[PDB]
Amino acid sequence: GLASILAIGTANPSNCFNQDEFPDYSFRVTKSEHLTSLKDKFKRICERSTVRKRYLHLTEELLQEYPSIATYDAPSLDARQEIEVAEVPKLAARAASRAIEEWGQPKNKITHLIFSSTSGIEKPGVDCHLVHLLGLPLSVNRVMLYTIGCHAGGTVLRIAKDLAENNVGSRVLVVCSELTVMTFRGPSETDLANLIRMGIFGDGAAALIIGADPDLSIEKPIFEIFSASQTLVPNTSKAIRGRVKEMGLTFYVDKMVPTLVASNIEQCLDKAFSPLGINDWNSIFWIPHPGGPAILAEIEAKLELKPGKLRATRHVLSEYGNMSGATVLFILDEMRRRSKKEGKGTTGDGLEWGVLMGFGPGVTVETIVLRAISVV
Known part of the structure; x- marks a missing residue:
């Protein structure tokens, strides 16, 4: 039959940012509080966003340890990569754990892993890091999708369908793990798109288990x-x-x-x-x-x-x-x-x-x- 979502888990960074307080916070940690005209433009962006809270891995502490990220154009990729190759798999693992617990089945029955991430481009990939963090079988068939990005939710479901439906007994762990560590930069009047981005975008990971022909005695298609x-x-x-x-x-x-x-x-x-x-x-x-x-x-x-x-x-x-x-x-x-x-x-x-x-x-x-x- 058809590839079915059998479980859904989610996870976010533990640090929560209220949108009300975010213009003050973001303009302080990027040392931009003197740009009162630009800060006013961002408050307005934040008020129209309809975003009340976001979870972000980037704290003031990380920006103090990696001050290049708090700027706009300074070389910062090495710092961002150092954070995300560690954190993208960890957040992915938290979401996958919740998905696997709801599913209720042993990890031995996971045969495929589809992992979508904007961040942490590395060899071996965050897909391999996730296998070792979760203790997934070493024989799991991996599809690592780096830097898609915003339509990736649809992409992983499209790929999961064909993997699930062509392999009898297959169970596909699907994970989208998104941190804004790679895109976050200081505000500038020369980049409106990035003001909008720093207002709208938050961090999160969602995992799900896809299989065709679930055993309805133990598995519940959603x-x-x-x-x-x-x-x-x-x-x-x-x-x-x-x-x-x-x-x-x-x-x-x-x-x-x-x-x-x-x-x-x-x-x-x-x-x-x-x-x-x-x-x-x-x-x-x-x-x-x-x-x-x-x-x-x-x-x-x-x-x-x-x-x-x-x-x-x-x-x-x-x-x-x-x-x-x-x-x-x-x-x-x-x-x-x-x-x-x-x-x-x-x-x-x-x-x-x-x-x-x-x-x-x-x-x-x-x-x-x-x-x-x-x-x-």
Whole structure:
């Protein structure tokens, strides 16, 4: 049958930053408190973000130990790499442990590992580090995806489906582990995209167990991955940009990205749901990647979605910020948990069919058709 999500675990850095206090904090540790005009622009960015809290690995203590990271352009990649090759696997392990505990099965039955990370590019990779941290079998088939990034939630589900469905008895540990250590830099009037980034983006790791043909005596499917499509939006390379440089990972998101996504989402939805004869975008549950509040606003407006469709998505954006590829997996967890707490008939807010969408560099749209499972 279809590749099924059997368990979902999440983890965040232990340090929590309230958005109210973040402009004061960020401008102090980057020695920028004298840039009162720029700090005012960032408070406004933070007020419109709809982000209330984020978890960040970067503390004032780490910036004091690695002062190059607190600047904008100073050579800092070695420092960032030293932090992330250690921390990306550790956070991944915390999320994978929660996923494996919910799953309830022994780690000997994990046959595949898909690991997506922006950070910690190294040989051997954070996928190997995770195998040794979790004590996974040495024979686990690994797919290490470095630097995708924001659509990676859809990417790992697309790859997990084919691995799970082509290997009888296979159980796929999927992990997205995202720290902002690699992209964090001091504020500048010469980089608006990075002001937005330092307002919206938070750290997090989400892990899940995928298998086809679960043993229903011991395993509980939460969602089925019905189909997975990727597409490029034509002539939109350069709309979402990042390069690994001596200053770490650079970051650019164009102000037109909300419009570009909303302008293309209908084609993706039509290709995904026409085979099912589904047409009404209010009749399916929604897991859109919350790049920011503007992208969610434009999707709602364009598809004329009812006021509550994106409740789960907005909750995760508000409570954790944008955790890149991990975010949609956090939203899957939020949706199934809210569904149980509100006594809905399915894991997908009482609805049978759902869409999960990643938006990232390309510009790339990852469209996953999910089937919810009946709760009783």
